[PDB]
Write a protein that binds this ligand. Structure first.
Ligand code: HEC
Ligand code: HEC
Ligand code: HEC
Ligand code: HEC
Ligand code: HEC
Ligand code: HEC
Ligand code: HEC
Ligand code: HEC
Ligand code: HEC
Ligand code: HEC
Ligand code: HEC
Ligand code: HEC
Ligand code: HEC
Ligand code: HEC
Lengths: 220, 220, 220, 220, 220
């Protein structure tokens, strides 16, 4: 309680690992896109730099930093701040990208619901163009419900090692009938028909559990 | 939430099956035309490649893809997009086919109704030639009513394992009468007659349910 | 919606019965000429082959067909086309018959009305010979009025299980008078007479209903 | 017991080390920010001046001091007073800093709990601005529980050579289901869905011990 | 035994040194605050006057004194009385100081234990003000245990040339755990946590010896 660390270095200086070893163990064995976000995986310092570059990046304003000789006061967060999966992957070369080299991600219409919305510009400029994302509403519902910060509830589902159990629904039957064009009777059949209506009958449920490695096992 | 997947591979990389196992189970037991659309059925990777090739094909523009080293931003859809049954089966050797090897399908007059229509060129060039499809209007009514995307409501009915219940109609009786050519009376009958009019009488209904295997059972 | 049928077989492959069971039930109990047009009646596959051979025959051009390995694009009709009762029964050994074994049917003068006509060659070559068909005009009036395709409105009337109600007409009386050959008077009668004119008087109607089995009941 | 020390010097005069040698040994080997808070580390007098400047600074009022010729009576503490880690690092150039050169530290919302609070002004003026500190509540809980004076229980945890053992918690599984938009059945799937609810299942524990040098070893 | 001393002088007259030479030798080499309490150090008479002024001051009542011509009977002590370190340093200008020029010392809350207490008024009037003395209880425990008169056991420890050996104690480890706010699972981590409890583990000892000159040597 009298020999506090030296923070004279650049970037993150104190060890984030004094209380966060489990996340370190998880991240050291990551084959994902960001193995080299910190410039390496073999050394502990590279992983610490990666954590600094992700959880202390240029999000809103300068974080808290210093080098013994001087210290820059923290503006909106001292140690670290949780950031959305997308705040880095929002704009690339078209606008002012957060990281030079970061690829602008996806392409969806801007999530503007009746209750909540997101400040990030989804359309990336091609507002009339990018609209045919089938999943789409998966992101919208995640944005609507505040479970993870901003839009991570759905974005983390299918890129990460996160097991998920979901309840699928699909009705047993959907069917339809058929009418004639003003003529029918003792003729076997009219020359032409017409079809209208599409009715429904009987309901089915489905549940599936997915493991960490992505294998899909259904408990049908 | 710190060990996201590797997408360095070509084509679809992450497992689509983390949330879609039931469709995998359905498709693995498919004896239909597209058992080998993904190059195989025995391995899971082949089925994943098939799903990529169908739901992420060249429809409008490049989908979202990457390999860790670089990433191509998605243009109109990030993960996958629902596509009509016909968007692949629309043109073959005559025009620019979507798949080299895909057979141009069917042959109908272009669906141009009073309200809606389809951009796909049905006639395949032989506009004056292909017209005598009896079913025809079945496709037109499916196009008119937006239940499935574009023209799948009817196209999926008779090629797939989709049970259907329809209400058939045919009137009980259609009949007609007979006139003479200016001569008749106490002669038994004139040398020649003429027949006109075709009238109707009494109505009949019919309903039929079809199972998955195509067996036709009618509840007459 | 992911396990569509296999069409690798020859001829019709998918089951036509997924939506047409009532016609199957009607045709299975047919004692008519075409019980064995499909090579059998006991098996469902034989009936399906019969439907293919009738509604998908060589009429104008190749229909749509395939076997998984390859697919032949449909030329003028994809699934099936309505065909006239006669298009098969038009020419036999004299010309190019549609079916080897099909018997050329009937024999009438070519229907060439003032408004419409038929491309099928009725006379079968013996143009000066086949002319004394009493019914004849029954076919002509059916051709004139587009109720069934081409010339089926009359052709289906007396060969099929189709109940018909018609209004017969015949005048009550047709009679005539008588003149002498320049001589008459107080002689009782002349040696010879002459007869001219044939007049008419009073009108009668008649209506008859015929059941499926051909029994003739008249509501006189 | 008759030759008491001379305190004629400025600042701290008597040796604090007559009973506090272990803390001296600990502080002499400090590579942290405050090696030169006393103007040196090599001489004992510099370390004594550092202890005076830290534990006898201008906190509330003048401490006890004298020079033989005169003595200033102690106001609220004679020898030394324990001071919070932050009482020096609370305000810099904006307000009246305690040390000219001391950097204002961190940036958090003012800790105003339902039970206790702190008089130090955390927001530093930018009340609406500094709010996105992820750790935040770590400081609040330390303030709530009186284990160290004011807000040192958490502030000393990650800057100092203080080994810590904590029990991490994270539940085994969190998952969710899925509903259709009024349409489903024998259609394979509806054009669009909706997703609601996020459920939980099974619990996991985690414990980690951290050494003096900051190495993170987890006993998973 | 017939030529007893002359005490006609003022103050102390007989030589205190006839039996107390060692204390004289100790005090002659004193660089502390009271070199000139007797008005000098060079002459023996000045040191004798200092001893008189300290051990024969106005404490409770007049001591024993005389000048041959007259003698004042001793009231509570004839030769000298042991006095507490503080009885002179208790009140200055606020109350009735013992010496005009004596500085009121320190500032602590009044020592009022469950068993013993002191009549001297510690708070000096600022009862609500002077409370933040960290050492504080060091004086209280000295007052509780009668080893030196009143409150000298601790007061003599850190101002005088008195070597001390003390046994320090501090436990090896004190640590804590962490809980979530109603949400956790397959989400990597919840948006926010909570921390409770502070546990202990393993014990450490420490002993230190301090010499006359104040150098701190620890036998760790
Ligand atoms: C008492 C509550 C605290 C005070 C006073 C300060 N901190 Fe911290 N701190 C933390 C990190 C991760 C850094 C990196 C900064 C760098 O690399 O220079 C810092 C830095 C500082 C600094 C210098 C930089 C600046 O002034 O902005 C000061 C003066 C400072 N800290 C004061 C992390 C943490 C932390 C982890 C949860 C806690 C509890 C504290 N800091 C507490 C205090
Ligand atoms: C937060 C909402 C998300 C961000 C940011 C990104 N995604 Fe995805 N994603 C998905 C698939 C099926 C792929 C295949 C691409 C490939 O094979 O390379 C991807 C890929 C990416 C990429 C790299 C490729 C590119 O930039 O176009 C990035 C940068 C990316 N994704 C960012 C699928 C999904 C998905 C399933 C429903 C979700 C929720 C997300 N992606 C979310 C995000
Ligand atoms: C979406 C509107 C459709 C597409 C695309 C295709 N069909 Fe069909 N189909 C039907 C039958 C009775 C057959 C028999 C052909 C055979 O036995 O091989 C077929 C066949 C095909 C084929 C392969 C043969 C070919 O290309 O000509 C393709 C590529 C094909 N179909 C594409 C019947 C029906 C049907 C019943 C009313 C409908 C709605 C569709 N087909 C729809 C589509
Ligand atoms: C008997 C209980 C005590 C009396 C009477 C005094 N002290 Fe102390 N003391 C201590 C320190 C660290 C200082 C520094 C002051 C300086 O540098 O001038 C002092 C100083 C004094 C002074 C002069 C200054 C003043 O009057 O404020 C006086 C008159 C004085 N002290 C009287 C520390 C300690 C200590 C360490 C735990 C103890 C037990 C005492 N002092 C006890 C007494
Ligand atoms: C022990 C003193 C820690 C050190 C060293 C670091 N962190 Fe931490 N962190 C700690 C706790 C007890 C918690 C949970 C408490 C809470 O109120 O949530 C956290 C949490 C985080 C988070 C997420 C915050 C949240 O989800 O609520 C992040 C992003 C985080 N910590 C980052 C982080 C970094 C980058 C560190 C190195 C500078 C670091 N932490 C060190 C305790 C401790
Ligand atoms: C007044 C007696 C202080 C107390 C109590 C604490 N700090 Fe300090 N700090 C003070 C000054 C005047 C300065 C700037 C001059 C200097 O020599 O640094 C600082 C600076 C720091 C820094 C900056 C270096 C860096 O962050 O890398 C840090 C980290 C720092 N102080 C930490 C710190 C901690 C953890 C404290 C409580 C145990 C603490 N300081 C108390 C003055 C004072
Ligand atoms: C869980 C994180 C999923 C993963 C992994 C994949 N998909 Fe998905 N998909 C998911 C949901 C919850 C839904 C329905 C939600 C909705 O708004 O509709 C879907 C739906 C589809 C669809 C059809 C869209 C529709 O009919 O509305 C398609 C074509 C689809 N998904 C494709 C697809 C592919 C190719 C995947 C591998 C890259 C894949 N999905 C993964 C959830 C999840
Ligand atoms: C800023 C700190 C980022 C955050 C937050 C996320 N990503 Fe990232 N990403 C970033 C950069 C600078 C790059 C390009 C450089 C590189 O080393 O890749 C990327 C790249 C990706 C990729 C590309 C590889 C691939 O797609 O196969 C993917 C898939 C990716 N990022 C995913 C991803 C996810 C799921 C994130 C939220 C958990 C995420 N990134 C956050 C910068 C940043
Ligand atoms: C349900 C998906 C069907 C399947 C399987 C088959 N047919 Fe069909 N047919 C269907 C409907 C809804 C209609 C009437 C709609 C209309 O627009 O007329 C028909 C009609 C026919 C006809 C006559 C057309 C007419 O008179 O207008 C024929 C000759 C016909 N169908 C043939 C046929 C064959 C051979 C099939 C097996 C390949 C077959 N149909 C399957 C619906 C469905
Ligand atoms: C592009 C992703 C396609 C989609 C969408 C559909 N089909 Fe397909 N089809 C495609 C190719 C490249 C081929 C030829 C190569 C092969 O392996 O077959 C086909 C072929 C068929 C066939 C031929 C076999 C047969 O008819 O017996 C059929 C019947 C067929 N396809 C049917 C079909 C249906 C019903 C579709 C919508 C659900 C459909 N295809 C979509 C490429 C693509
Ligand atoms: C081609 C698909 C045909 C259609 C359309 C019709 N007929 Fe047919 N018919 C065809 C063949 C190849 C044969 C000879 C082989 C055989 O199994 O009969 C026939 C035969 C007849 C007969 C002969 C038996 C008899 O007259 O007693 C009759 C009566 C007959 N066909 C009637 C008929 C009718 C009424 C049709 C329209 C509803 C019709 N045929 C169509 C081939 C084809
Ligand atoms: C022996 C006579 C000591 C001298 C010389 C100094 N200190 Fe001390 N200190 C001593 C003891 C026996 C204790 C613990 C007793 C208690 O009641 O706590 C302390 C404690 C402190 C503390 C912390 C108080 C606490 O945490 O309770 C501080 C800040 C402190 N001491 C400072 C200090 C300084 C600056 C000194 C030089 C003037 C000094 N001490 C000398 C015993 C002795
Ligand atoms: C009355 C006989 C006293 C006794 C008993 C003690 N002190 Fe004293 N002290 C007294 C006076 C009149 C003065 C001021 C005049 C002077 O010459 O100093 C003092 C002063 C001090 C000082 C001030 C110098 C400094 O603190 O640096 C100190 C430190 C001091 N006194 C200490 C001290 C101690 C430790 C005593 C008990 C052993 C003690 N004094 C007793 C009068 C009297
Ligand atoms: C020999 C005849 C002495 C003369 C001359 C002085 N003192 Fe003394 N003193 C003497 C003895 C044998 C003792 C200890 C005996 C005992 O019962 O304690 C003392 C003790 C003191 C003390 C402290 C008393 C104690 O701690 O118990 C004091 C304060 C003291 N003496 C003062 C003192 C003064 C001021 C003298 C000059 C007038 C003086 N003493 C002379 C023996 C002798």
């Amino acid at each position: 309680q009298h020999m506090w660390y030296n923070i004279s270095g650049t970037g993150n200086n104190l060890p984030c690992e004094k209380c966060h070893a489990d996340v370190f163990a998880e991240f050291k064995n990551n084959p994902g896109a960001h193995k080299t976000i910190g410039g390496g995986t073999d050394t502990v310092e590279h992983i610490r730099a990666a954590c600094g570059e992700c959880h202390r990046t240029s999000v809103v304003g300068t974080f808290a930093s210093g080098d013994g000789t001087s210290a820059t006061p923290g503006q909106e967060a001292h140690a670290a701040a949780t950031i959305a999966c997308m705040a880095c992957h929002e704009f690339g070369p078209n606008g002012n990208a957060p990281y030079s080299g970061a690829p602008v991600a996806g392409g969806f219409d801007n999530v503007t619901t009746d209750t909540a919305s997101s400040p990030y510009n989804y359309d990336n400029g091609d507002t009339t163009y990018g609209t045919k994302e089938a999943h789409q509403t998966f992101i919208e519902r995640a944005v609507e419900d505040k479970t993870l910060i901003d839009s991570n509830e759905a974005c983390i589902a299918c890129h990460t090692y996160v097991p998920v159990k979901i309840n699928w629904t699909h009705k047993v039957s959907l069917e339809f009938n058929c009418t004639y064009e003003y003529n029918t009777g003792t003729s076997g059949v009219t020359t032409h028909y017409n079809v209208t209506n599409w009715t429904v009958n009987g309901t089915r449920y489905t549940t599936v559990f997915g493991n960490t490695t992505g294998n899909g096992s259904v408990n049908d």
